[PDB]
Amino acid sequence: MKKILIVSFLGKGRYYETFYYSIEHSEKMVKKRLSPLANAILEKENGNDVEIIFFVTNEVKNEFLYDENNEYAKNILNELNEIKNYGIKVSYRDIPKGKNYEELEIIMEEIEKLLLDFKGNKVIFDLTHGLRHMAIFTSSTVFYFKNLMEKANKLEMKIVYGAYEIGEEIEKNLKKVPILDITQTLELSDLTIALEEFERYGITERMIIVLKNIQKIVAKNKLCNLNELKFSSLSRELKLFEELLKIPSPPEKIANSIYKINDILESSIREFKLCSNLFFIKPIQKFLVDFQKIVLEKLPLDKKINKYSNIATLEKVEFMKNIIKLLINWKMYSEAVIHLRELLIDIKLIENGKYFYYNNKDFREKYWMYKELPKKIEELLKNVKGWRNSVAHGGRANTSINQKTLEENLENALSMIDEILLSMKSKKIYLLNSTIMPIPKDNQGKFYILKLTKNEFKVILENAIKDDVLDSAIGHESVIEFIKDKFEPLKRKEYFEKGESALVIKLEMDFMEELIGYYYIYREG
Amino acid sequence: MKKILIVSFLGKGRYYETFYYSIEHSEKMVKKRLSPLANAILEKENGNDVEIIFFVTNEVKNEFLYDENNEYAKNILNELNEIKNYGIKVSYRDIPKGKNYEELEIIMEEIEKLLLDFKGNKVIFDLTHGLRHMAIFTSSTVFYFKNLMEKANKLEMKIVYGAYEIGEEIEKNLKKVPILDITQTLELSDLTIALEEFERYGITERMIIVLKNIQKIVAKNKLCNLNELKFSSLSRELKLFEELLKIPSPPEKIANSIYKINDILESSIREFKLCSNLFFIKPIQKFLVDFQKIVLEKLPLDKKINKYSNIATLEKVEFMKNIIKLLINWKMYSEAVIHLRELLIDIKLIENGKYFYYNNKDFREKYWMYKELPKKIEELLKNVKGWRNSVAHGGRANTSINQKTLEENLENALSMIDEILLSMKSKKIYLLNSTIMPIPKDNQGKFYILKLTKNEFKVILENAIKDDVLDSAIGHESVIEFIKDKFEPLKRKEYFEKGESALVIKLEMDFMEELIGYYYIYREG
């Protein structure tokens, strides 16, 4: 059971008898004079607690209602008196006619105080009766009232009215009138609110709430199924994406989240296309189209990054370039600086070929500190290090910076990184088949090893193939069988000099599928 | 000159002749039949380009308008024909009656396409004529239309209508009717939009725009003056505050910005109180009250911090504690971690008495690295350093963290810092009167010096006074005269051992006012 308040006005009129039905359920028709009474009856038949409050004016009640020789007035009076028999609560509230902005302010205060004093679950504005003036003003003010009382009462709010001008006419002056429900117009502007919030700041609160509401209302009528709706999944993924961005995280999870967002977005849009109605379909289709526009605009896609999670590549460099640009756009400056540092680390790993230890931090530091392109990269390094510590150290000791000069410095970094990225367009690498450290017998050694995936394996393998720098050392045959069966020189010779890099694999083939590239190995000593 | 589009419906009716006036200017009255025509005339008398578009239905125009034996219909037809003589552009647009949600969607599309095809400056929805149905639906949908076309047309939008039900009656069926302007209801919910944005994220865009609009509309009627309105100043200060928070900055500027915000807020509220109207005063008074509530809630005040900008104190520690709590609340996690590091630096400076060099960074680092309370502070240090580098280094090398464990760690730091702050409740300090380095003649020396303000001078001076640790060395008399005349032992003896700390001042007294405490001096060698 829910507790419910119906708010209507009450103006001079003929108040003909009407067959009100909810346009959702044309089955239940209630023949009454007041639309609020019909709505109250439809709600008490749902086992709820319902109360109606009318706003009357002195000009109306001591000139129309209690005029005993106005047939329409006594008709509506008799109905207002028999309202109490159905189990519904009726009361009256004096207001002015609203002839100026001061009186309209008074009316706003009256409605606002009523909503504050309501202690139930739902409130319905029934705009059927009263002045056209009052109906228009209330319709305009309802959204303000909801936004006001989001943090006040936690109250559900509906806007309905009997659209008697579009009602069927069954007998003389007798009309079949639908109680239209325009409450969907309230959360029509919340859509654009979410759009601005995400487009300018990347905030998902409005987006998550709106998506949950959208999935509810598309689940109203069950013609549309799941396995491709997954708006719950899309809202959860947006939550994860915000947690990943405002808390800095590796490029792999960010690229995966962007790929997931794109996949779920297009899948859910295609699914939603086939649902033919009972509410406003077009605005939310426009909403999804606009959100897909912004997603494909501001979120950089690279569908095939997740396959290189253990190393540092140039694709990750450009991806983080676009990510930092996005972070700057959303005014997320600190996170942008933090990501820039690691992007520079990755670039110098690429430029120095030390990219095996993108999962080791001691190496990251040791080359955080210790032929022109080296000189240009040093140019960029010195530029960036010239201003990073103002952001990093919080500006203490008289060394802070405004947004203008920070924007200056960030676009400096952007320009130089795009420069050197466009400008960046192979020792002996043996080929092994097991995890080993065979050092020459006269050596006194330090060795690094890293787990890999199959794609990286293939890439560096053909790099060794067609740079003449491959010293292949496969000793048996079925290895080559799987090599050409999967990946598209059997020099069976036993040595590892400090510095040489090599590749490894350890164990028809379907069973196997049920490891194929890993354990890249290099002697730093 | 502006280009203007008036949009109205056109329904069956008697269309009596009416004296329309703008309620702002009751001087100009226009006697016509259609409120849109009166509005168009009032706008062309302003030297603008005006066009009216009516939405008619087949049921209305081929059953009412061109019925040549309906007197009201031919009256309104003659007026619609003479509209072209005033220099105004009239056109018709077919729509359904809107008997269901599909047809209402159609109507929304029609209005939306009209607003997209408009290439002028202003659009006015005149809700005087047409169905009550259509007026209600349009009034509800206008805010959605504005939010939609914020990024589409950059179009000013007004909602007006002739409130003929509240019009004076001057002669038989002849009414003096005001064209009411409820456009202020559109930007009534934008107020709460700004409130949520600031209260949950600290975004000032909506706040700045709303404050600028507020100052415009309070400048409509000039009863309220400046020197205490300064809503322009408040918007600028909010912009500065956001730039100070999302780009980490010293506590001094943050405390100054909070003090400025509070001062301008209360000053502007008191000033706004005296303006008696022409628009809705109450909602924006509620807006200012709510924003002051949130300001005094989430922004910690300390009116008397700016006086200690050169040193590190405990007040700054608690202030930054509250600031980091606020940063956590606004989901600004990276900036919160960065501020926490410097707060810990300040705490250990307090605990080790090395607080002279809050404006020197080498010292900050050298004690960033190198009796129980020391042990508890080391507890907190080790805790915080155990997880800072996950945030600092971007989570590379498989060392990231979710929001849940980061919240865990941040509240760990919060609890321990409040602990040790509650738990924290003096060598020989000579007194000098000039900048000097007199080392004993047998010494081989390094000396630090810092400019100060007068309040810090007074504080440490009485600390030396009543800890018995003052070796005062004032050699002459007028120094003591100014000492007791301003601040409320003349041991004229010449030495500075490495480690002793001392105070200095250099040059009736009003002229002077037109330096009083500075150059605190200490030998680290």
mmCIF file of C-alpha atoms in Angstrom, chain A residues 123-339:
data_model
loop_
_atom_site.group_PDB
_atom_site.id
_atom_site.type_symbol
_atom_site.label_atom_id
_atom_site.label_comp_id
_atom_site.label_asym_id
_atom_site.label_seq_id
_atom_site.Cartn_x
_atom_site.Cartn_y
_atom_site.Cartn_z
ATOM 1 C CA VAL A 123 1.745 13.202 -5.368
ATOM 2 C CA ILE A 124 -0.259 13.706 -8.564
ATOM 3 C CA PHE A 125 -0.938 17.105 -10.111
ATOM 4 C CA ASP A 126 -4.316 16.779 -11.853
ATOM 5 C CA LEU A 127 -4.496 19.731 -14.241
ATOM 6 C CA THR A 128 -7.970 18.947 -15.611
ATOM 7 C CA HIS A 129 -9.924 21.565 -13.658
ATOM 8 C CA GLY A 130 -9.321 25.194 -12.799
ATOM 9 C CA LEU A 131 -8.105 28.147 -14.803
ATOM 10 C CA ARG A 132 -6.058 27.695 -17.955
ATOM 11 C CA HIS A 133 -3.783 30.267 -16.276
ATOM 12 C CA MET A 134 -3.201 28.016 -13.271
ATOM 13 C CA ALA A 135 -2.734 24.864 -15.357
ATOM 14 C CA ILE A 136 -0.030 26.521 -17.473
ATOM 15 C CA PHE A 137 1.782 27.986 -14.467
ATOM 16 C CA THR A 138 1.703 24.681 -12.556
ATOM 17 C CA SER A 139 2.900 22.716 -15.586
ATOM 18 C CA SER A 140 5.846 25.089 -15.908
ATOM 19 C CA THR A 141 6.654 25.009 -12.165
ATOM 20 C CA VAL A 142 6.423 21.243 -11.550
ATOM 21 C CA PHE A 143 9.996 20.492 -12.651
ATOM 22 C CA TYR A 144 11.283 23.186 -10.301
ATOM 23 C CA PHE A 145 9.221 21.624 -7.516
ATOM 24 C CA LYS A 146 10.725 18.170 -8.166
ATOM 25 C CA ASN A 147 14.284 19.488 -8.260
ATOM 26 C CA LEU A 148 13.542 21.418 -5.059
ATOM 27 C CA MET A 149 12.187 18.426 -3.163
ATOM 28 C CA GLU A 150 14.704 15.839 -4.350
ATOM 29 C CA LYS A 151 16.591 16.549 -1.103
ATOM 30 C CA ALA A 152 13.485 17.408 0.967
ATOM 31 C CA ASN A 153 10.787 14.709 0.865
ATOM 32 C CA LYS A 154 11.867 11.947 -1.575
ATOM 33 C CA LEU A 155 8.428 12.158 -3.153
ATOM 34 C CA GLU A 156 7.204 10.633 -6.407
ATOM 35 C CA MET A 157 5.495 13.245 -8.579
ATOM 36 C CA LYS A 158 3.068 12.720 -11.472
ATOM 37 C CA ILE A 159 1.339 15.114 -13.877
ATOM 38 C CA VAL A 160 -1.954 13.896 -15.318
ATOM 39 C CA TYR A 161 -5.079 15.447 -16.696
ATOM 40 C CA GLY A 162 -8.272 14.492 -18.452
ATOM 41 C CA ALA A 163 -7.796 15.594 -22.054
ATOM 42 C CA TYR A 164 -11.501 16.190 -22.552
ATOM 43 C CA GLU A 165 -10.980 18.155 -25.773
ATOM 44 C CA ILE A 166 -9.823 14.948 -27.520
ATOM 45 C CA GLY A 167 -12.420 12.647 -25.930
ATOM 46 C CA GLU A 168 -14.814 10.379 -27.793
ATOM 47 C CA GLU A 169 -18.443 11.527 -27.612
ATOM 48 C CA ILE A 170 -20.725 8.613 -26.766
ATOM 49 C CA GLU A 171 -23.982 10.402 -25.883
ATOM 50 C CA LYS A 172 -25.300 13.944 -25.534
ATOM 51 C CA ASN A 173 -22.599 15.840 -23.585
ATOM 52 C CA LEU A 174 -21.229 12.457 -22.429
ATOM 53 C CA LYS A 175 -17.567 11.896 -23.296
ATOM 54 C CA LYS A 176 -15.054 9.070 -23.045
ATOM 55 C CA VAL A 177 -11.970 11.019 -21.970
ATOM 56 C CA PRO A 178 -8.434 9.654 -21.408
ATOM 57 C CA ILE A 179 -6.424 10.678 -18.368
ATOM 58 C CA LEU A 180 -3.191 11.563 -20.145
ATOM 59 C CA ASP A 181 0.105 11.190 -18.276
ATOM 60 C CA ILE A 182 2.745 13.734 -19.313
ATOM 61 C CA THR A 183 5.081 12.926 -16.403
ATOM 62 C CA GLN A 184 7.578 11.652 -18.981
ATOM 63 C CA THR A 185 8.135 15.293 -19.951
ATOM 64 C CA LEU A 186 9.634 15.938 -16.500
ATOM 65 C CA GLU A 187 12.536 13.550 -17.095
ATOM 66 C CA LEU A 188 12.917 14.731 -20.690
ATOM 67 C CA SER A 189 15.221 17.616 -19.707
ATOM 68 C CA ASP A 190 17.102 15.391 -17.250
ATOM 69 C CA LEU A 191 18.331 13.650 -20.407
ATOM 70 C CA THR A 192 20.072 16.788 -21.663
ATOM 71 C CA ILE A 193 21.275 17.530 -18.125
ATOM 72 C CA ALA A 194 23.083 14.176 -18.228
ATOM 73 C CA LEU A 195 24.404 14.959 -21.714
ATOM 74 C CA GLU A 196 25.998 18.247 -20.642
ATOM 75 C CA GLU A 197 27.387 16.707 -17.444
ATOM 76 C CA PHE A 198 29.096 13.886 -19.329
ATOM 77 C CA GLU A 199 30.205 15.952 -22.336
ATOM 78 C CA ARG A 200 31.896 18.629 -20.226
ATOM 79 C CA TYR A 201 33.017 16.738 -17.100
ATOM 80 C CA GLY A 202 32.542 12.989 -17.631
ATOM 81 C CA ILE A 203 30.143 12.521 -14.707
ATOM 82 C CA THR A 204 28.093 9.328 -14.870
ATOM 83 C CA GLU A 205 25.587 9.862 -12.022
ATOM 84 C CA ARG A 206 22.866 11.290 -14.255
ATOM 85 C CA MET A 207 23.806 8.800 -16.983
ATOM 86 C CA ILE A 208 23.503 5.764 -14.693
ATOM 87 C CA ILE A 209 20.175 6.906 -13.240
ATOM 88 C CA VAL A 210 18.741 7.718 -16.681
ATOM 89 C CA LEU A 211 19.862 4.386 -18.139
ATOM 90 C CA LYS A 212 18.242 2.489 -15.265
ATOM 91 C CA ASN A 213 14.998 4.419 -15.819
ATOM 92 C CA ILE A 214 15.225 3.734 -19.565
ATOM 93 C CA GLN A 215 15.560 -0.004 -19.033
ATOM 94 C CA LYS A 216 12.571 0.076 -16.666
ATOM 95 C CA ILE A 217 10.334 1.807 -19.190
ATOM 96 C CA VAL A 218 11.449 -0.421 -22.078
ATOM 97 C CA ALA A 219 10.630 -3.349 -19.770
ATOM 98 C CA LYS A 220 7.104 -1.950 -19.321
ATOM 99 C CA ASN A 221 5.955 -3.838 -22.436
ATOM 100 C CA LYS A 222 7.952 -7.021 -22.923
ATOM 101 C CA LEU A 223 8.357 -7.007 -26.717
ATOM 102 C CA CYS A 224 12.060 -6.164 -26.220
ATOM 103 C CA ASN A 225 14.208 -8.871 -24.624
ATOM 104 C CA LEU A 226 17.611 -8.939 -22.915
ATOM 105 C CA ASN A 227 20.968 -10.438 -24.061
ATOM 106 C CA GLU A 228 21.199 -7.223 -26.064
ATOM 107 C CA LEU A 229 19.448 -4.601 -23.917
ATOM 108 C CA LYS A 230 21.966 -4.699 -21.054
ATOM 109 C CA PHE A 231 21.428 -1.055 -20.111
ATOM 110 C CA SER A 232 22.168 -2.268 -16.590
ATOM 111 C CA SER A 233 25.511 -3.478 -17.946
ATOM 112 C CA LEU A 234 26.090 -0.143 -19.693
ATOM 113 C CA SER A 235 25.407 1.820 -16.497
ATOM 114 C CA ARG A 236 27.753 -0.459 -14.530
ATOM 115 C CA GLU A 237 30.443 -0.052 -17.206
ATOM 116 C CA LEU A 238 30.078 3.737 -17.067
ATOM 117 C CA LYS A 239 30.514 3.570 -13.286
ATOM 118 C CA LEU A 240 33.659 1.477 -13.777
ATOM 119 C CA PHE A 241 34.948 3.895 -16.425
ATOM 120 C CA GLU A 242 34.570 6.876 -14.095
ATOM 121 C CA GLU A 243 36.311 4.970 -11.299
ATOM 122 C CA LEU A 244 39.099 4.138 -13.761
ATOM 123 C CA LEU A 245 39.559 7.742 -14.888
ATOM 124 C CA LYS A 246 39.284 9.717 -11.645
ATOM 125 C CA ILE A 247 41.565 7.110 -10.037
ATOM 126 C CA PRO A 248 44.491 6.783 -12.473
ATOM 127 C CA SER A 249 44.871 3.283 -13.878
ATOM 128 C CA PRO A 250 46.794 1.448 -16.630
ATOM 129 C CA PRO A 251 45.956 2.017 -20.310
ATOM 130 C CA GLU A 252 44.885 -1.622 -20.689
ATOM 131 C CA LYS A 253 41.799 -1.338 -18.475
ATOM 132 C CA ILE A 254 40.918 2.046 -19.997
ATOM 133 C CA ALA A 255 41.058 0.666 -23.548
ATOM 134 C CA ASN A 256 39.047 -2.374 -22.438
ATOM 135 C CA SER A 257 36.421 -0.130 -20.831
ATOM 136 C CA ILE A 258 36.166 1.995 -23.985
ATOM 137 C CA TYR A 259 35.836 -1.141 -26.137
ATOM 138 C CA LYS A 260 33.171 -2.518 -23.782
ATOM 139 C CA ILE A 261 31.290 0.795 -23.834
ATOM 140 C CA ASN A 262 31.314 0.873 -27.638
ATOM 141 C CA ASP A 263 30.239 -2.766 -27.988
ATOM 142 C CA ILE A 264 27.408 -2.516 -25.450
ATOM 143 C CA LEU A 265 26.337 0.826 -26.934
ATOM 144 C CA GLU A 266 25.923 -0.375 -30.513
ATOM 145 C CA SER A 267 24.453 -3.715 -29.399
ATOM 146 C CA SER A 268 21.852 -2.041 -27.169
ATOM 147 C CA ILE A 269 20.996 0.539 -29.844
ATOM 148 C CA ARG A 270 20.409 -2.152 -32.479
ATOM 149 C CA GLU A 271 18.302 -4.085 -29.964
ATOM 150 C CA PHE A 272 16.263 -1.017 -28.983
ATOM 151 C CA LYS A 273 15.554 -0.281 -32.655
ATOM 152 C CA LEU A 274 13.015 -3.146 -32.742
ATOM 153 C CA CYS A 275 10.328 -2.061 -30.287
ATOM 154 C CA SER A 276 7.783 -0.113 -32.405
ATOM 155 C CA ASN A 277 3.677 3.981 -28.530
ATOM 156 C CA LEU A 278 2.769 3.827 -24.836
ATOM 157 C CA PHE A 279 5.182 6.730 -24.163
ATOM 158 C CA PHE A 280 7.671 8.999 -25.930
ATOM 159 C CA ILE A 281 10.071 6.794 -27.892
ATOM 160 C CA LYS A 282 11.680 9.452 -30.098
ATOM 161 C CA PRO A 283 13.394 11.619 -27.413
ATOM 162 C CA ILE A 284 15.257 8.666 -25.892
ATOM 163 C CA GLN A 285 16.321 7.453 -29.335
ATOM 164 C CA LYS A 286 17.770 10.940 -29.831
ATOM 165 C CA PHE A 287 19.371 10.599 -26.385
ATOM 166 C CA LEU A 288 21.123 7.351 -27.321
ATOM 167 C CA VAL A 289 22.204 8.794 -30.686
ATOM 168 C CA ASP A 290 23.703 11.863 -28.990
ATOM 169 C CA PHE A 291 25.486 9.784 -26.348
ATOM 170 C CA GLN A 292 26.947 7.545 -29.052
ATOM 171 C CA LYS A 293 28.115 10.695 -30.860
ATOM 172 C CA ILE A 294 29.897 11.907 -27.729
ATOM 173 C CA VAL A 295 31.339 8.434 -26.990
ATOM 174 C CA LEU A 296 32.799 8.045 -30.486
ATOM 175 C CA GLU A 297 33.977 11.682 -30.306
ATOM 176 C CA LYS A 298 35.777 11.988 -26.955
ATOM 177 C CA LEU A 299 36.662 8.365 -26.117
ATOM 178 C CA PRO A 300 39.494 7.065 -28.339
ATOM 179 C CA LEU A 301 38.968 3.523 -29.613
ATOM 180 C CA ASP A 302 41.580 0.850 -30.220
ATOM 181 C CA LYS A 303 39.831 -2.525 -30.410
ATOM 182 C CA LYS A 304 43.103 -4.494 -30.370
ATOM 183 C CA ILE A 305 45.132 -3.154 -27.436
ATOM 184 C CA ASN A 306 44.123 -5.639 -24.714
ATOM 185 C CA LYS A 307 46.313 -8.229 -26.442
ATOM 186 C CA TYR A 308 49.558 -6.472 -25.393
ATOM 187 C CA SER A 309 48.966 -5.918 -21.681
ATOM 188 C CA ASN A 310 52.462 -6.898 -20.484
ATOM 189 C CA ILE A 311 54.662 -4.587 -22.605
ATOM 190 C CA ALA A 312 55.036 -0.991 -23.802
ATOM 191 C CA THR A 313 54.171 -0.092 -27.413
ATOM 192 C CA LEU A 314 53.659 3.032 -29.531
ATOM 193 C CA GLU A 315 49.910 2.372 -29.795
ATOM 194 C CA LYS A 316 49.685 2.775 -26.022
ATOM 195 C CA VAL A 317 51.599 6.055 -26.391
ATOM 196 C CA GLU A 318 49.109 7.529 -28.856
ATOM 197 C CA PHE A 319 46.181 6.121 -26.846
ATOM 198 C CA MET A 320 47.414 7.814 -23.672
ATOM 199 C CA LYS A 321 48.019 10.979 -25.708
ATOM 200 C CA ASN A 322 44.330 11.058 -26.594
ATOM 201 C CA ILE A 323 43.397 10.046 -23.027
ATOM 202 C CA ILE A 324 45.355 12.956 -21.544
ATOM 203 C CA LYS A 325 43.739 15.304 -24.065
ATOM 204 C CA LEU A 326 40.357 14.039 -22.840
ATOM 205 C CA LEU A 327 41.432 14.478 -19.205
ATOM 206 C CA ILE A 328 42.430 18.078 -19.935
ATOM 207 C CA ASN A 329 39.050 18.684 -21.573
ATOM 208 C CA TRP A 330 37.202 17.465 -18.455
ATOM 209 C CA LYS A 331 39.328 19.862 -16.332
ATOM 210 C CA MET A 332 40.957 16.824 -14.666
ATOM 211 C CA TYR A 333 44.428 18.345 -14.588
ATOM 212 C CA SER A 334 46.204 16.440 -11.795
ATOM 213 C CA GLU A 335 45.345 13.038 -13.264
ATOM 214 C CA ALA A 336 46.507 14.331 -16.656
ATOM 215 C CA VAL A 337 49.953 15.258 -15.287
ATOM 216 C CA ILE A 338 50.282 11.880 -13.552
ATOM 217 C CA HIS A 339 49.439 10.023 -16.782
#
